[PDB]
Amino acid sequence: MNTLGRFLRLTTFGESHGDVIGGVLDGMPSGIKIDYALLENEMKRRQGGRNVFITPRKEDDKVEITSGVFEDFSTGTPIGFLIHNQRARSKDYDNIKNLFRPSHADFTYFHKYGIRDFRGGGRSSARESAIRVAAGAFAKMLLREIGIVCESGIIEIGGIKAKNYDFNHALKSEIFALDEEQEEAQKTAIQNAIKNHDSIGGVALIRARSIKTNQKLPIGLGQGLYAKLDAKIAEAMMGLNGVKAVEIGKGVESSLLKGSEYNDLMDQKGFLSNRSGGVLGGMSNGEEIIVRVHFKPTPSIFQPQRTIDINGNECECLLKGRHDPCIAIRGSVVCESLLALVLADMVLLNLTSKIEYLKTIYNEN
Amino acid sequence: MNTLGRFLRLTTFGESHGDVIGGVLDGMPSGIKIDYALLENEMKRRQGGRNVFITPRKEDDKVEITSGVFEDFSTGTPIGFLIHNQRARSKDYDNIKNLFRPSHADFTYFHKYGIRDFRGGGRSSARESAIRVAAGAFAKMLLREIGIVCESGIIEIGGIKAKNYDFNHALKSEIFALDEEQEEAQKTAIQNAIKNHDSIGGVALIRARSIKTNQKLPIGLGQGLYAKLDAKIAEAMMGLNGVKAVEIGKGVESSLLKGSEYNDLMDQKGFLSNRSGGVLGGMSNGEEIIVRVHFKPTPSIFQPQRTIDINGNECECLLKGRHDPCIAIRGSVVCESLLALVLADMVLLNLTSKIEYLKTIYNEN
Amino acid sequence: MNTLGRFLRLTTFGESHGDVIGGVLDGMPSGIKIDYALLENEMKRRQGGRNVFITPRKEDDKVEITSGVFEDFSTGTPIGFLIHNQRARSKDYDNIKNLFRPSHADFTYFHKYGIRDFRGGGRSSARESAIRVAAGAFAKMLLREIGIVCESGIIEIGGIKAKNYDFNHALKSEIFALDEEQEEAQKTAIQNAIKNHDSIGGVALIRARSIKTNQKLPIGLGQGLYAKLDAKIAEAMMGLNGVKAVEIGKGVESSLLKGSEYNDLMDQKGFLSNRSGGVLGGMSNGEEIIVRVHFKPTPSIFQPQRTIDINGNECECLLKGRHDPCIAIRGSVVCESLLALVLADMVLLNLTSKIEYLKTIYNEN
Amino acid sequence: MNTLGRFLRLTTFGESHGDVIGGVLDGMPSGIKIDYALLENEMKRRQGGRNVFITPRKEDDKVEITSGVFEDFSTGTPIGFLIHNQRARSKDYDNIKNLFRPSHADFTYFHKYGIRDFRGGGRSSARESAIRVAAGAFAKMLLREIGIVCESGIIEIGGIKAKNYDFNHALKSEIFALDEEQEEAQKTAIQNAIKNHDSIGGVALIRARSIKTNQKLPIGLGQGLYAKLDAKIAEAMMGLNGVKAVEIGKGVESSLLKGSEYNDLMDQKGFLSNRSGGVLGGMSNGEEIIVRVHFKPTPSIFQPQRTIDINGNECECLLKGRHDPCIAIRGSVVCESLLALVLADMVLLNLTSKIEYLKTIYNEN
C-alpha cells in the first residue's frame, strides 16, 4: 500500500534507487497559499541539521511541484512533486550485496517478493522520509489556516532523558535536544557510539497545539471506531522504519496508575491535567496532543555481524563507512510531518460530523 | 469509520443502547469449516476467567449468524451476525447522566456530534468488543488453515510484573495471568482496588506463532510502505479504548540499547534472537510476533470526581455500584482478536505478491 | 466488497436465506430528523406498490433501526437496521436445485466460490434491494436538508416508450409509468408476458433536482478524476442485477450527433439544453441529473430451458410458479435510492473543496 | 480521488500544464517481465486518430520508469513513471484564457474550487489518458501471464455502424474501424466534420478474451455486491470525458428482449450465446466480455462557439486552428487500457475467493 490518508491522501513512487523520487498529495482544499520558505526549511530540518551547514539550496534536496498549484495557491487538484538527489560522485558504505543485513528489511523483502534488488544510498527510509516531510509541509499549511501547529524534539538518547521541554531550543540544537541541561550527556552518548562504530536508540516527543496561546484545539478530531485519532497516529509512527513503540500522553506509565491518579478532571475552561495526551475516546479533547515515539538503534554499524546469505550459508556482515549513529534524531522531524498529515486528514474528515456544517456551506456559503 | 481491514473487512453497527448488536465480516474465503465451539468459547473468554461461572447458552453471548455460512462452511460472501442480551429486571446504578464522566468518551462525543446519549451499561465498550471477539473467531478459523495461532495474557496488573510467561496457564487463570508465581500478588492489587473503590492499569502480552512443522510464520506479511504489519497492529490495538501505548518486540526497551545489543543476528538455523518482535522492515520475519498493550486504569470508579455537565456547569460525578477494577484483563482477549483480524487480513493481501502465485491458481487451474 | 460509498458508506450483510437481513449506513451527519413516514413509504414502493393491498404490518417487511438514532435524530454514529421477513412454507417452483438457472448467477457463484448453496425466495435481488431502499431513505433525508430531491419512473416496457413524463402520475401507477397515455399498452405487455410465462425488459428514468422552483443543484459535485459524479452513478446503477446499460442525459443519442448539433452552452447560471444530464467534465453543472437504466427481462420464466447441472450433464430447467414479469419496475425504485446514496456521498465529500469552508467551520465555531 | 483500483492501484499526479506528468502503479506482482515494446506500441496507438493517417508519428511522449523495476522485471513494489512531452513554442490554435468554453468543465471547476486556473491543451483528458495507457500496458503484461488479452476498435462513427468486426483490421486502420466495408463512409464523415470545423460522436467496442484460441476466461472475476465486474467496468469507462453511456453485452437492446429470447442457454461446455457480454450476476462467466462506449461529439470545434466566461460576462469562442473531430477514436484505445486495469485488479482480488487458494500458496510451498 503506497498511500497514506483517507481524504488527504499521500501516495508515493515507493522504494527506488534512481536519482528521482516522486509523490502526490491529494485532498488539499483550494485557496491555501503555498509557503515555499516553510517547505524549504522543512527539507533542511530533515537532514538532521547540526553543527555548521551551508545553503541547502544547491547543497541538498530540492522539491519540484509539478501540479496542483496555480500562482502560489493550491488549486484543489492533486499536488504532484518530484525530489532529485545526488548526481556528483560518491564515497563508499556497503559490503556484500548478497547477504541479509541484521535489523534491515533485506530478509523480509527477499521472501515477500523474491526479486533481490538491494543497494545502499539511503536504501529506503531516507528517500521516503523526504516524501513525507515535503508532504507534511503542505499539511502544515492547511493546519495553520485553522490555527494549529505541530512541533517535535528529542527527549532521550541512550536512556539519558530530558527533564524539561523547550521546543525552541530543540530547533537550534545539533541533536534537537529538548532539555539543554541533558544535551551534552546526550551528545556524548552519540560521540561514544561513533567512536565505537556502534549505534544507539532514542526517543522523540511530538506535539500538536494551538498557535493562539493556550486556546483549545478542535474537539472531536478522529473518526468513528476504526479511524480514531490515536489509532491513526500510532499507525503512522509505528510505520516509520526503526520505530518499536508509540505512546499517547501518559503512555506506558498509564498502566502503573490507579483510576483516581489518571482520570483527567474538568472545570469550565477545560481539563485540569493531560494524562490522556489530548486524545479521549479516540478523539481530540482540546488539550495538547502528546506523542512519544521509540526508535531502536540504527541498524547499520561498522562491526562484524553473523548472518546468512541468500543461499542460507553463514557469512560475516561488515558494513564499512560511517552510519547514522542514532536514527531517532532525523526521525523526530519525520514523526512531526506524519502527525501533521494525520491531523490535517482528520480536520477534513470532521467536516461531515454535524448537519449544521452542511447547511452552513450549502444553504449559505 | 466503522470498518476495520482492507480485504478481510469487519464492519459494525456501532454504539447503540438496544438489546441487539451486529456486525458483518467480509472477505472470508469459502470452504472454511465454522468452528461453533471456538466461537462460543471466545465469547466466554471475553467476559473474564473466573473459576466460578454459569454454563453458556444463557445470560449473555450467543452469536446469531445470519449469512455467509451454509452447512457449517463459509460461503465466501459476507458473514453477518447478531448478538443479543438483556432480559427482565437487573440492579440499579444511575444518578444523573447529563455530565461528562472523567476519562470517558462522553466529552469528545458530545463536542463532535452535539448529541447526549451516554447512558447506563458502562456506555458501551464491551458491546464493540463482543463484535470484535466474534469476528476474531472467524479470523482465527482462517489462520488455523495455514498453521497460525494467536495467544495472549496479562503480564502486569497495577505494576505487579510477571517474570515468566506460560500461555497455557493464562487460559485457566482467573485474571489470565501468565506467571503463576505473581498471580496472587496481581489478584491482591485488584482486590485493593475494589476495597478502595478505585481501579488499576495493566499490560497485556499478545502473540502469534506458527503451529506448522517448520515453526515459522509466513515471511513477508505486511503491505507496502503505508500498510506495514506493525503499523496495522498498532492501529488496531491503540484504537482499543483504554489503550495508551503499543509495543512491538523489544518495544520501549529498544530505545535504551546500542546497535550491537539490539540487532538480531542469524545463522544456518535462522534468527538467533527476536528483539524485532517478529516484524522486520514492516513485514513478518518468521519469528513469533510480540505485542505489548498498555491499559490505563478503568475510567469508572465509585469516587467523587469534579467535572462539568453538558452545559458547562461544574458538578460532582459520583458513579455508584461496582465497576471493572482493571479493564486490561478483558482487554487482553480483545487485543488477541484484533491481532487475528489484522494477521488474517494480511495473509489475504499477501496472495498478490508474486506472479508465481497467480500462475498457480489460474494456469495450474 | 459489501460496502458502497466513500464518506456515506452503506455496508450490507449480503445475500442470505434466513428470515433476517441487515445493513448499516455510516457517515450520516448528526442532527437530521429521522423521517419514519418516508422510510416506511419507501419500503412500500419497493414492493411493486400496485393497487389493492393490506396493512404492511401483518403483510410485509418492517425496518427496525438498532443504532445511530436518538430521540428521532441521527446521532452521527453508525445507523444499523434490520429487516425481518418471510411467511408460510413454499412449495417447489424447481425440482432438482442442483442446476444453473439461465441468466441467473448460480453458474458464476458456483465457480467463484465452489459452494452449492442456492436457496429460492427472490434470491440475490429483492433482499438486497430492501437494504438499498431503506438506506436510500436516510440519504434522501440528508439531501432534503439542502433542498435536493430524487425521483424516478418507468419510461419504457417491452419497447413501449413514454413521450411525456409525469412523476406524480408514476407515484400512483401500478407500474410507475411516466406517460398515462402509454400506460395501458405497457400494462397489456406485462399481462401478455405473464400469460406466456415469459418476461420483458424495461427502461427506468431517474432524476435529481432542486426542490426550489427553477433553482439549480449544487455546482461541482464529483471528486477528482476517478470519482467523477457520472462515473459513480454508472457504477451504482450497473451494479443492480439486471442492468445492462446506463445512460446520462442525451446518453446513446450523443454518439449520433454532431458538435454543431450537440455541444452545450451557458449564460450565467446553468446550461439550458440538458443534454449533459446535469453532469459536465465529471461534475454536476447545476442542471437536473438525468439517468436512464436498461433492464434485461427477468431471468426466471416458467418455461423449459436448456442448461447443465453442478456436474456438467445436460438437463432441463423448469421453474414453476409465478415470477416477476418485469424487474425494471421494482428496479426503478432501487435506482432512485442508489442515486440518493451517491449524491449524498458527493455532497459530503464536496465539503472539503475550499479552504474557506474549513475556516468557516473551524475559525467561526 | 486520484486513484483507480483496489489491489492494482493507479494513482495520478492529476491535471497539470507542465512539461511532465506522472503516475504510479501499485500492486503489481513481482516476477513480471516488463515488455518495453508493448508499452511503447501502446503509447503509439494512443496518438493515432488525429493528424496521423498512415505511418503515424512517434516524435513525442517518452515514458520514464522510475521504480518498481529491476533487471526488466517488476519488483513487487510501486512502479512510478514520468511522461515527458510537449514541443515547439505556443502561437495560435488558442483563444481567450478567462472563459469556460462551451460544454467545458471549466465552469464547474471554478464553482467547486474557485480558482482562475486552466491554460488549455486538450484541457486535461489527453494527459490523463497518457497515464492510463502507460499503466494499462503493465496491466496487460499481468493479464498475459494468465492468458488474457484486451482489444478494441470503432464500431460506429456519426451513425454509420459496422456490421462485421475485425479487430485485426482495426489495428492497422487510420480510424481503428472494425468493418472495412463501412470504413470509407466512416472516414468521409470525419473528413466532412473537419472541413466544416465540426465534430461527430462515435462508439467504441472493447472486449477481453482468453488468448488461447477457443478458450474460456476465468469464471468468477468480480467482487461481492458492490465491486461487481460490470459495475467497475462501467465506472472506468463513464469516467472518460465525453462518454455518455456504457453498454455490457446486449446493452440497450436488452430492454427490448423477452426472457425466452435474452436468457443464455448452456451447452455441453459453454453458453450457446453471450447476450450477457461475459458478465452474469456481476461476475465473469467465461465468455467474451463485451463493452460498448458512447462518446458525444467533441466540445471544442473550430467553428464559432458560445457559452460563458468566469464572471458570467461576455467573451468569444472563435477557436482558431483545427480540433479533434471525433474523440471516440483515441477514446477506444484508452477504454481498452481501462478494461485491462479493471480486469487485472479483479484477477488479483479473486485470489482470495477459496480457502484452497490460501492452502496452495502457503502450505504447498
UniProtKB/Swiss-Prot annotation, chains A, B, C, D:
Belongs to the chorismate synthase family. Keywords: Amino-acid biosynthesis, Aromatic amino acid biosynthesis, FAD, Flavoprotein, FMN, Lyase, NADP. Its cofactor is FMNH2. It catalyses: 5-O-(1-carboxyvinyl)-3-phosphoshikimate = chorismate + phosphate. PROSITE patterns: CHORISMATE_SYNTHASE_1, CHORISMATE_SYNTHASE_2, CHORISMATE_SYNTHASE_3. This is Chorismate synthase. Reduced FMN (FMNH(2)). NCBIfam families: aroC (TIGR00033), PRK05382.1 (NF003793). Its EC number is 4.2.3.5. One of its GO terms (molecular function) is FMN binding. It comes from the Bacteria. NADP(+) binds at residue 46. The keyword Chaperone does not apply. Pathway: Metabolic intermediate biosynthesis; chorismate biosynthesis; chorismate from D-erythrose 4-phosphate and phosphoenolpyruvate: step 7/7. CDD domains: Chorismate_synthase. GO terms for biological process: amino acid biosynthetic process; aromatic amino acid family biosynthetic process; chorismate biosynthetic process. GO terms for cellular component: cytosol. The keyword Lyase applies. It is an enzyme of class 4 (lyase). InterPro entries: Chorismate_synth, Chorismate_synth_AroC_sf, Chorismate_synthase_CS. PANTHER family: CHORISMATE SYNTHASE (PTHR21085:SF0). This reaction introduces a second double bond into the aromatic ring system. FMN binds at residues 123-125, 241-242, 281, 296-300, 322. Homotetramer. It comes from Helicobacter pylori (strain ATCC 700392 / 26695) (Campylobacter pylori).
